[model samples]
Target: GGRLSVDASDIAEASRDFGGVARAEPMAVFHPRAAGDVAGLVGAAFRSARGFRVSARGHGHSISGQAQAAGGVVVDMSRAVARALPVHSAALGGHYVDVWGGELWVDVLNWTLSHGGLAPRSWTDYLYLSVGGTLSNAGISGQAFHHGPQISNVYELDVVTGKGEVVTCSETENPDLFFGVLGGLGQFGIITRARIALERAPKRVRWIRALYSNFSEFTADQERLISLGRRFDYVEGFVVAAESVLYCLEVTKNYDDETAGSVDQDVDTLLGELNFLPGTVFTTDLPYVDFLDRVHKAELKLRAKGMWEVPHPWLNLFVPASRIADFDRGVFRGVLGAGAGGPVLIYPMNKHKWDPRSSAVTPDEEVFYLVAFLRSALPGAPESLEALARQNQRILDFCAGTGIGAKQYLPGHKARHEWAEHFGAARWDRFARLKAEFDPRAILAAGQGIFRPP
Candidate 1:
């Protein structure tokens, strides 16, 4: 609760996030040893005469400046966990792990697997993200349809409020604060610790990829797979718009070492029922850990070529299943005649799996599609970044004009009005009220821009 570390280079580094699109030079970056230190810094900011704000930077993976605090204190929560990363296990009925919010998902995964071969039920595609970072948003991946997003799998959380109080909340205790902080976009409080739900880990995975030429077939197959409920352990798809609109579905089946040989026949039987392109099926077998960390392989290649730090003008949306075809026609086939530089991922999720009480917002349909435009530009090409940014705006404008009922994921909006519309009238009202109650001075996460402080 006393002194913290700060340096000129470190302060400059703290000002930016993964997007590299927005930068705000924070006044200083504080390295906290524990949650008490976090409370002390936040309390001081709340009491400051100038109304200083504070934001907890976890892995600094936010695409926009969502984790940055301009001219205010940025608590380096990753630094806080460096010294003390508490991992406690509970044996009540099922296994669960208590982890520091600053801990990365990779570390959590490895730690849990090492201890008792247990793993979280749901996960984001990338494992390097911080626990609090993804939990602040809705962590979604192929497993979401089965187990729901990471928010739904959380048992409880310990958050440091703007008033300097450390409150432990769950669905039963302090339910309002519990739901508000989960997927609250770091608005209500800074999550210090989280108790995550777990599942028994499989030893191996059967990974498969297939391509579809028609959009209707692609989405229909996806919907069928998800509706089946017990066929695939993981299901997701991607759209390669630039190369003549090729649609791809990626699915997997998880099994133990004992049944590895028989899993191939099982996958074949499942694929036999579907209507994918006859000759486009591809299959592979890998260890469970390798399958989950597949994205890291691509990341390594990008890093080697020095393209990993490029400017990313990413846009993610959750569109109703009914409007997905219209969206694909208008945006993928019409607007993006060529590729989107990186990946255009389109996948279906069951609406019933999500919790309505959680702060994370999703469409109100039985089924919805996650349409993500992950655009990246090289460091040598400023024009490339600008063009992609403009293209993203056009896609967003089209969605709004056509009344597609599309909601942004990890959204970045310029005005409070847009945020209100994004969360809808009822949810926005509750969110605003909770923000007022928990962070009246607005001394937390100013970069989110949902509400202004003071």
Candidate 2:
């Protein structure tokens, strides 16, 4: 509503996100009053000779400054829209619950669950992520397999195109726009409000964490659960360094012989024959919300340690079911080796329901695996953050060399070859076409490295 000139330092607090893995040098950030403000900024950017680049920031969990821009105006989506209940059902045969793009997913979850008696079918590992944030990248988590991604669950959206036009669309109405904004990574348009589909909320979760001695066994169990087709509400797993496995023995002293007996009986002795601790096991149960946000605890610890402020070199990839064992061997044991200052999360998800037309790409296999190497190093460590970045490159190299059908998730790879291969030849062209139709300038999400040529 008003003309304001501000330096990067003025809005620096809102310029960054949790994915502290990227080098950021933002030119100027615009705090929009509403979607109209965002659209107006877009309109003005086009009119100006400078022709600024604009990105809609949700929770800003993007690891590569995907929400940040250099020498360009950044539309602060933090208050793009406000949460509102449906005044009337949409023509699309669904209820429209309006929510601002900058709203956190955790808040959305709480609101939707309480009002409509439902929640998002799929979620991210962390609930605190922004609604527009995850929808932009294909919101993922343990529940993604059965319900598709968070992008697939929405019924409609309000978007500010690169042209600074505010429009609403759905699957039937402006179908192209609807799909474009879903997994387009803020490339096509900046979503200001979304009409998400809701589902029944469960009261509690039956949390389970069982250790496996062999990498193969761990993946196999995860694959079975995802393939079981939503039989379990949640499923995910993590790998520990062989050296840390000894911690199991320490816990055996506390629990009685009955508990110890169950651990020895269930655990694979043959795999245990390998190196590392003989037995180190742990398990617990908690509320559904608590379990969903379990990773936030680690995030809090990282924040307290000041490691959360550093740049992240996080690499997440989707590997085909068939190539998972090989991937674990090379990436888990070989490249990462006995774990590091970060956590390595590996789990399987179903691919049948994912819309092939959406910009988000999954592995070709029916059952695919998500490999996340989230590492954080302090001010002083044996290996610097640069080393971790190099390791990420090596992992990507190994995948390319071995013909691994792996696709980088969330942030696209920095190279054209990697981005093209990740999305596959058939889908990449359509993505480009969507870009031309909605974002002729290829302006949004420039941080993603997808629209590099222009």
Candidate 3:
């Protein structure tokens, strides 16, 4: 246990996240005053060799143990890391802003927009996640198909490595360290600040949620939009229950009465002719901010039903375009049965835009789908959240049993072979090499159970 003590009550309070799973007792907790404080604490951990791992905790929003470290030094990023978004006044070429890695993404978005900027993109179905936490694992959303993951949007990062060195890195500067930490999962270092790419925000959004009776039409439209080169500011798709129609959420800042009227008519006509349960379709238009905050509504609904805080055994799979339909069929129908207890997200992304050199991996093909099984432990008296978790397992088992080429997002567990498979034969060596070079002592993210303490 750590020497610096806090009230045991606070320790218990600080160790949990949104997932409400994987609770643990840290050896010690330190609230740093600045980036310098973070560096000092990490350096102290290194010198002591008490097997003192320093894990960054941000908003406690991470799933499973990704945000908690069992019996190690947990550095609270929520402290010291400023809430303000850094303005990049340096000529627009590498237009970026410096933001504390611990800032909540919603705060970042609000601040960035206020400062004449916006996050290049977002992840599927979420916005309350932490900047550093998501960047550590790719920070994916509907916009990823075009802007690439959040890792791709960053111009640079300020990281305190496991070796206790606070360094600033970009693609050109400290190339290995930069790319390594882009999606490095906090294994290489703790990101204290990031120079995230930014662009102008539209004043309003023409949000369109349409239903599709056929999956083929849904996927085809998604692919076309991705290839449109910013035709739509945002594009994402998801599946409804059994043999149900597909739904799409399209967003754009420029909305007019005529255009809005056309969209309303077009969406209705498109789905009206389809064979879906007629009244199941819904549509709406809102400001850019509201569209961005759309997922929060569903979150509230889940919270009311006592499902939001349940154990989420999420299984995120990246499948090449060639196998998307096949993978979808197997997982939704054959394995998970339409994700009974949660949402089944099926969205397409371009492989070309993603930086292959980063630690994050996608299919080698031109396009792929991020098939996610967002599950929750069943609610008692109503239904079992555990049953939902079992459903998640069945989906994962299908991926494993079928030998589907998929990787676990926010991967945990101590097994090296599983990690190897996640990266595959082509990039495994590079991934491991980066791991050893930056975190040689393997003292970061011990909660992942991927590496042993030195």
Candidate 1, residues 154-255, lDDT tens digits: the string is 988999998888999998899999999988999999999899988889998989999888888888899999988348999999986533778999999999
**Candidate lDDT (C-alpha), each:** 0.86, 0.70, 0.70
Mind giving the per-residue lDDT tens digits that candidate 2 earns over 183-206? Answer: 788888888888877655554544
lDDT tens digits by residue: candidate 3, 1-454? 2235476865775577666667877877877766777778777776774757778887776667776777777777664234555555566564467788877777777887777646545553567777788888887777887788888888888998877889999887898988888777788888988877777665566555566666666776777667861266566666666443345534343344546546555544444444433465455667767777878888898889776766566667777777666775776556644222666677788887778888887767888888776766664422454556566677667767876666667775458887777778767888778778777777787777667755
Q: Which pairs clash inside model 1?
A: 242-338, 242-339
* lDDT of prediction 2: 0.70
**Rank order (by TM-score, best first):** 1, 3, 2
**lDDT agreement of model 1 with the native:** 0.86
Residue 282 miss distance in model 3 (angstroms) = 3.8
RMSD per model, one decimal: 2.1, 6.2, 3.9
The stretch of ten residues in a row with the least summed lDDT in candidate 3 is 244-253
Clashing pairs in 2: 20-311, 20-312, 21-311, 21-312, 248-279, 248-280
Please tell me which model should have the higher TM-score, number 1 or number 2.
1
Give me the candidate number with maximum lDDT. 1
